[PDB]
Design a protein around this nucleic acid. Structure first.
Ligand SMILES: [Mg+2]
Ligand SMILES: [Mg+2]
Ligand SMILES: [Mg+2]
Ligand SMILES: [Mg+2]
Ligand SMILES: [Mg+2]
Ligand SMILES: [Mg+2]
Ligand SMILES: [Mg+2]
Ligand SMILES: [Mg+2]
Ligand SMILES: [Mg+2]
Ligand SMILES: [Mg+2]
Ligand SMILES: [Mg+2]
Ligand SMILES: [Mg+2]
Ligand SMILES: [Mg+2]
Ligand SMILES: [Mg+2]
Ligand SMILES: [Mg+2]
Ligand SMILES: [Mg+2]
Ligand SMILES: [Mg+2]
Ligand SMILES: [Mg+2]
Ligand SMILES: [Mg+2]
Ligand SMILES: [Mg+2]
Ligand SMILES: [Mg+2]
Ligand SMILES: [Mg+2]
Ligand SMILES: [Mg+2]
Ligand SMILES: [Mg+2]
Ligand SMILES: [Mg+2]
Ligand SMILES: [Mg+2]
Ligand SMILES: [Mg+2]
Ligand SMILES: [Mg+2]
Ligand SMILES: [Mg+2]
Ligand SMILES: [Mg+2]
Ligand SMILES: [Mg+2]
Ligand SMILES: [Mg+2]
Ligand SMILES: [Mg+2]
Ligand SMILES: [Mg+2]
Ligand SMILES: [Mg+2]
Ligand SMILES: [Mg+2]
Ligand SMILES: [Mg+2]
Ligand SMILES: [Mg+2]
Ligand SMILES: [Mg+2]
Ligand SMILES: [Mg+2]
Ligand SMILES: [Mg+2]
Ligand SMILES: [Mg+2]
Ligand SMILES: [Mg+2]
Ligand SMILES: [Mg+2]
Ligand SMILES: [Mg+2]
Ligand SMILES: [Mg+2]
Ligand SMILES: [Mg+2]
Ligand SMILES: [Mg+2]
Ligand SMILES: [Mg+2]
Ligand SMILES: [Mg+2]
Ligand SMILES: [Mg+2]
Ligand SMILES: [Mg+2]
Ligand SMILES: [Mg+2]
Ligand SMILES: [Mg+2]
Lengths: 158, 134, 263
RNA sequence: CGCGACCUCAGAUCAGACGUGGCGACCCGCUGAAUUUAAGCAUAUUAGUCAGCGGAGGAGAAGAAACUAACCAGGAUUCCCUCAGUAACGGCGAGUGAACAGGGAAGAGCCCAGCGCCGAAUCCCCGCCCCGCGGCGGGGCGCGGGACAUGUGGCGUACGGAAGACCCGCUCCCCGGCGCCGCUCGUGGGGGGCCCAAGUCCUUCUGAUCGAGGCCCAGCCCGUGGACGGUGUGAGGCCGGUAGCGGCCCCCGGCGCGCCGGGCCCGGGUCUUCCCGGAGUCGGGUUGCUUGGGAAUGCAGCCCAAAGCGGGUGGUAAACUCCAUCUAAGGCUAAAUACCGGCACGAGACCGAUAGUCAACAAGUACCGUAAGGGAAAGUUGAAAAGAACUUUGAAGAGAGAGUUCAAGAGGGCGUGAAACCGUUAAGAGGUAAACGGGUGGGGUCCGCGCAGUCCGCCCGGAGGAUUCAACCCGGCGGCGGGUCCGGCCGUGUCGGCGGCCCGGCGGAUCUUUCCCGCGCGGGGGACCGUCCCCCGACCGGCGACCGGCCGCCGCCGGGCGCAUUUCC
RNA sequence: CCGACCCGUCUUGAAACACGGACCAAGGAGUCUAACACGUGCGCGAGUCGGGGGCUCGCACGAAAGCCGCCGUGGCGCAAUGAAGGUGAAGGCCGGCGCGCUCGCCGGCCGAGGUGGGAUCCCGAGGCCUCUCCAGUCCGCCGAGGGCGCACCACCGGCCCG
RNA sequence: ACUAAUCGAACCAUCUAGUAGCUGGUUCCCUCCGAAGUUUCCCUCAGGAUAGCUGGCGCUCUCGCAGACCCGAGCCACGCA
RNA sequence: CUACGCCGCGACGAGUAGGAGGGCCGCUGCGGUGAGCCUUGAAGCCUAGGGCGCGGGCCCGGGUGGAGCCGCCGCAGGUGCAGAUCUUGGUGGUAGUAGCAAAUAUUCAAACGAGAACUUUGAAGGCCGAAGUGGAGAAGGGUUCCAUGUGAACAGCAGUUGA
RNA sequence: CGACUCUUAGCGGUGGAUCACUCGGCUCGUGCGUCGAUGAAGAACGCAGCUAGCUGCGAGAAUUAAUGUGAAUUGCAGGACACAUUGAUCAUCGACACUUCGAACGCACUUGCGGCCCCGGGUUCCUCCCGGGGCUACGCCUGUCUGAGCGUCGCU
């Protein structure tokens, strides 16, 4: 029954809610397990960046967020084509690709291809056989200059 | 203190393990200190109790310097029986009084190849520890 | 408690025309349990009233600014001899209460040299008090693994570990604390300020960068500054005895006028 | 009027395999209420929930757009935060109720059919030989069978693809072992086994002690070990353990090099010529259920029934028109996620034998019901059985002695041992049932070291002692004051910035190369400003409760002298 | 000796011929979650909040605590109003001008108007002083009146949206 | 009528701690304040909402706070009943 | 002069439902603290013992007991019982009472035995009266069958007897 | 004076509260995350020198082997066991074994009864009896063998 002034309240507790209650006592354990998995993956891919492939510069869709820019899923095939990278070699050398993304304007295209060229300049490539360096890189710049990168590769900044 | 997350400090769990231990680790539980002379001779401190070694009681009603040979290691009741450590019962017969092996000290070991091997193993581990902590 | 506790009986009420209370009764026969009350908080073997549940909201979230404020208060109180004495930490021969030792202590390895350091710092009496206080707890904690209790000892605050934790940590009462990770639960153990703290020199120097001056914001917290006083001078005696206060006062009325018996 | 081939069927204890049933906490596909709420009740709600049926796995399902959007656009699935108790649904009542964008956890993409080309290039089975066994593979041989043109394999899949030329680059793949490293790695990768510090020191308490006191050298000994448990209490040092990138032994698994057996076949760019798609499906009508989906979100039954610049979607039915977006009717896929069942662990501000699981115990047991099913009660001698020998009465149960024990006023349902109730003893009382409140009185058990009644400050008098009383000397230590006497400084300003983007920081939505690397279009480096930083120094206020040195005064203490009309007991 | 009916409960009314209660022991009933509202305490304050995530020997305590800052996305607040398309909160004085036509073009100022109350604060004629006086040195108290007026209230104006 | 001592719908388990405006109960002490059975509306009349009666928390003001013992030195508060 | 303290003056004091404050009232556990207590005796319990407080309650003495417990500052509750035809367990009065009364019936002697109304043997008197109180089966029971021994409990008295 | 009744106290009964303890639960978290026709889960019946339950096991039956360990098990008895011409006990468990029902599989069961192929015996190959061993369920896949059809054809 209502009592004097108050807010008309509509609790959604008519549907036997106590059979489905998700407690979070395993939240610290989940954080520990996720951290351990991250560290194990980083050890597994030793010189490769821990966060993973480089992501493209991507403008947010709606009118609320189109002033901001973030990281996308993968570089578009047009970007790779004008940057001179094969769409099947990009994933091997650590470049995320998104075959279903299009380039409506040219400014975003050019920004992403300068991003790709900068990444390619900063990339250190190890030869398949360390005793036989075919075309990857000089041993001088991969002996001590190789280091696992922490955080996103070339983080997207407004 | 204890840091290993796989050994428990729970009182109930430790008591359950102790009272339901099988005999092959009840033997380790029922260990006794060696005398000062034996501790000097063999670089070991404690030894599991054995059927035919001579001990002396250092606590309880039967304290003294008399040396008695063990005659029974009753592992089910966690006790041992010694030669003259006994009492008369009502009908005039003598019964051995069981006392805990941690309350005796071994003065002479019953030595065979297995006891000797355990003795050198313990001494070697102790020496390695001393050289590590030097 | 178990959500099934007291509710796995299939009992039902007998009705009203059988000269017994209308509580549900266990069905069947041939056992003591048959015809006994069930499901009620008043019934033996029944369900407790309002069974305890895991979603009690065990945790509380505290504002970060308030937590930092409490850390600052605990640190400020730890440098006042009256408050540490009132916590009972036996500081009577300590040369200086904001006790700061050289960074060599951070590299200690053995427990003997930690004991020697405490003895030379005249902080060994607090450890002896902890030893004297090691007794047996009263109640159910003995069956719930809180078997032993003891006095809280001093808090060694360090900047960098080079073996100091291993050198200490076998001394009862001694609690070690990283300066970058100060814990209010260790600085005010019972919620009372004034725990005896021994500082390493590098930790003592890092305190300014950790919490800032009133002129500098903290360089290691990126938005934090020391809180302000609402009373700059707390010396009530000197404030009241100051001549400018005294000139403004009326004369005291120090005569007691007790009731007059009406003759 | 038989013999063959194919097709479609049948039998077999044919050769070799596979499925069934259980568990089912989590997951998938169905089926699916009513209690309840609406203060009645029928739609609604409960709820796509309980119950019912089927099917899995260590996860499952989902999943690489016939998507979201409408923006300067994002870009598989799943999970978290938020959107949001919102849009919306609803006797528009009660109530119900998402999604997009955004931030994160994780991140991985792909394969067919078709259209085509390639002498079916393809696959299974059976015999023979060799290399191997450890999950049964590799190689070779068979004018050995079979499947298969009613279509196997290679290339290839919407991100386009193929074939030709022209140019450029030879770029280096995976598979199972032989021997051994970095020794697998937050410091062993895992499993198992055995080990590794220090008091039973002296004196005492006790039935027993792990209790109490002590252990000269800054203090018994070890401590990377002071978790825990056991032991006749209450133990870091008696024992097991505990700590330790501690030791030793056994077994198993994946990481590089040289070799081994064999496979393994060309990649990119440009131009030209060709080729490009899933049908009783979409879609439409109607019906029923479902959804927040509202002129109908999804699913299904029935009827109609497609197209190819086509089709789907674009949250109000419809026609015309432009635009955007994807490419359905085939398939696979790890991670992040779930887990009240199972195996093995760890912990707790939880419960403590009417509690906590029904079950601390020969508990889903005893027992009950024809059955489905229902379902308890029940822990504790003692440190150790040392569990009462022996004598005695009785037919025995049961007693009296004796004995063990620290204790049987602990004697096998035995720790402690309340109340209700009962027996006996002692005291008191008793015809208005007991019991009760207020007020006295009597008796009684106890208490008061009750039983000659306190103390203590000064002074007077008496009779005795003793350093020493005061004042001076020396030394130490405090308190207070001092133009800052001398420093050390402290607060607020104030100057030259000698002082810092090389030789002090951090910031600025402040201006720039008009000195420096990207198209007249970025990133650096500078200048300025704001807070600074330690400094060279000065002036103002002060010695402050931030401290020292000198003096001055006072006080205390220690040692002298003072040895008697002082001082004290 | 005087006073004194048996408690609990529903009830206008219980000692009731109203119900429960033979006695004793142990157990036994406003709890937790979520959402609101108001009050109080604390921190910060036009802001506030890391709760989800991440970083820190991964773990006796510690499943804690600490930190993030281009993790502040986001929530709530800072703007309302309308079904919606949408729109969206500064005035007072001195002036020269049309025609200062109940209004259009600018300057100079100041920055949410005014009335009546309004704690507090400010000024304050005149008083209170000593052994006394003609003559002024410094400040303390009382003080009729007057002034600026906090919060808040009543009212009158003004501004935003329909 | 009978359908396992059960029949105008058996028994068992579950949904289920079904709902109840109705009955019963609802656990320590002291101190302070202290009611209502009336208005209006309700498929309302053994119940609610609503106003009233109650308590708690305050806040805004008024008289001054007087002489250190003592001693006033026409006019005597906002406002209320 | 624990300023959350201390002191003065004046008026006032009913109370259901209900509201609020205080609690150096009480229970359990956690963080601190008492160089707390304790085998030279903890908790619990008993007590014609001494007291304190308006009260909730508390302290001390004596006994029993045999291993743990408490004060203070905070924290947290499954935190206080006379009732609920309350739940479980235990115990009274009733009360040595109702009762041990359906189907005719027992008596004598002896034996064993501590013990005989009930056992056994003998004698006598009766009953079932062949549709039986006889002799054998089915269903159901499951060792009750048979011998020996015992006299705890059971056979609603007893038992030397017994399913 | 007694009995009886009441009150109080001492002692003794009845009863099992209180307190202390706890090899049990409850809750949370972690790592794994594995059944079965090669016969599971479940059930029954058996197995110890003295053994009813619980527990363990399966006619090799409170266990065999192997490995580790290293002198016991224990309520009583018995007997091992130079611990080295190898070893009690316990643990681990990878070898071996694992009765009858049960998806339960020759048919069927509140009972019982077959069929086929081998081996041994009574027989003295020939098949009657007895014993032992191996097979004999349903569905379904590939292949094989044997077939059916006034299905479609070819030759005659
Ligand atoms: Mg219960
Ligand atoms: Mg207690
Ligand atoms: Mg076959
Ligand atoms: Mg209803
Ligand atoms: Mg209703
Ligand atoms: Mg109804
Ligand atoms: Mg279900
Ligand atoms: Mg199945
Ligand atoms: Mg899957
Ligand atoms: Mg799928
Ligand atoms: Mg696709
Ligand atoms: Mg909101
Ligand atoms: Mg719904
Ligand atoms: Mg990520
Ligand atoms: Mg093909
Ligand atoms: Mg040791
Ligand atoms: Mg102990
Ligand atoms: Mg110990
Ligand atoms: Mg170890
Ligand atoms: Mg439209
Ligand atoms: Mg129980
Ligand atoms: Mg008990
Ligand atoms: Mg008898
Ligand atoms: Mg005793
Ligand atoms: Mg007893
Ligand atoms: Mg009595
Ligand atoms: Mg009533
Ligand atoms: Mg009436
Ligand atoms: Mg009454
Ligand atoms: Mg009457
Ligand atoms: Mg009546
Ligand atoms: Mg009634
Ligand atoms: Mg009655
Ligand atoms: Mg009753
Ligand atoms: Mg109670
Ligand atoms: Mg944290
Ligand atoms: Mg924002
Ligand atoms: Mg005003
Ligand atoms: Mg107005
Ligand atoms: Mg009910
Ligand atoms: Mg009524
Ligand atoms: Mg009153
Ligand atoms: Mg309760
Ligand atoms: Mg009661
Ligand atoms: Mg009678
Ligand atoms: Mg009779
Ligand atoms: Mg007759
Ligand atoms: Mg007959
Ligand atoms: Mg018989
Ligand atoms: Mg009888
Ligand atoms: Mg008694
Ligand atoms: Mg063996
Ligand atoms: Mg038959
Ligand atoms: Mg034919």
């Amino acid at each position: 029954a209502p009592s004097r002034n108050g807010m008309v309240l509509k609790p959604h507790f008519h549907k036997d809610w106590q059979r489905r209650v998700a407690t979070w006592f395993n939240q610290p354990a989940r954080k520990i397990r996720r951290r351990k998995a991250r560290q194990a993956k980083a050890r597994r891919i030793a010189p490769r960046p821990a966060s993973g492939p480089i992501r493209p510069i991507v403008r947010c869709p709606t009118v609320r967020y189109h002033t901001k820019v973030r990281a996308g899923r993968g570089f578009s095939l047009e970007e790779l084509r004008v940057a001179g990278i094969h769409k099947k070699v990009a994933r091997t050398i650590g470049i995320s690709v998104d075959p279903r993304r299009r380039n409506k304007s040219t400014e975003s295209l050019q920004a992403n291809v300068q991003r790709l060229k900068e990444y390619r300049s900063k990339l250190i490539l190890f030869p398949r056989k360390p005793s036989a360096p075919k075309k990857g890189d000089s041993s001088a710049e991969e002996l001590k200059l190789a280091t696992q990168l922490t955080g996103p590769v070339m983080p997207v900044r407004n | 203190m204890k840091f290993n997350p796989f050994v428990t400090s729970d009182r109930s769990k430790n008591r359950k393990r102790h009272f339901n231990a099988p005999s092959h680790i009840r033997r380790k539980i029922m260990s006794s200190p060696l005398s000062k002379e034996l501790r000097q001779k063999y670089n070991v401190r404690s030894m599991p109790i054995r059927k035919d070694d001579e001990v002396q009681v250092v606590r309880g009603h039967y304290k003294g310097q008399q040396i008695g040979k063990v005659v029974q290691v009753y592992r089910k009741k966690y006790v041992i029986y010694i030669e003259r450590v006994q009492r008369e019962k009502a009908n005039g017969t003598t019964v051995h009084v069981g006392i805990h092996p941690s309350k005796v000290v071994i003065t002479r070991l019953k030595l065979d190849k297995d006891r000797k091997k355990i003795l050198e193993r313990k001494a070697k581990s102790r020496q390695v520890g001393k050289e590590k902590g030097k | 408690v178990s959500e099934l506790a007291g509710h796995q009986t299939s009992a039902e009420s007998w009705g009203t025309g059988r000269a017994v209370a209308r509580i549900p009764r266990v069905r069947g026969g041939g056992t003591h349990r048959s015809g006994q009350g069930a499901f009620g908080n008043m019934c033996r073997g029944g369900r407790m009233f309002a069974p305890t549940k895991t979603w009690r909201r065990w945790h509380r979230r505290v504002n970060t600014t308030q937590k930092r404020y409490a850390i600052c208060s605990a640190l400020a109180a730890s440098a006042l001899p009256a408050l540490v004495m009132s916590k009972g930490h036996r500081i009577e021969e300590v040369p200086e209460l904001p006790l700061v030792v050289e960074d060599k202590v951070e590299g200690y390895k053995k427990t003997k040299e930690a004991v020697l350091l405490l003895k030379k710092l005249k902080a060994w009496n607090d450890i002896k008090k902890v030893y004297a206080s090691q007794r047996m707890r009263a109640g159910k904690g003995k069956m719930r693994n809180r078997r032993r209790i003891q006095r809280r000892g001093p808090c060694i605050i360090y900047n960098e570990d080079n073996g100091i934790i291993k050198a200490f940590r076998n001394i009862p009462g001694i609690t070690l604390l990283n300066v970058s990770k100060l814990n209010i639960l260790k600085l005010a153990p019972g919620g009372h300020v004034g725990r005896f703290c021994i500082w390493t020199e590098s930790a003592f120097r890092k305190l300014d960068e950790l919490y800032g001056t009133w002129r500098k914001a903290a360089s290691l917290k990126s938005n934090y500054n020391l809180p302000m006083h609402k009373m700059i001078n707390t010396d009530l005696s000197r404030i009241l005895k100051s001549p400018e206060i005294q000139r403004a006062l009326r004369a005291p009325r120090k005569k007691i006028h007790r009731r007059v018996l009406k003759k």
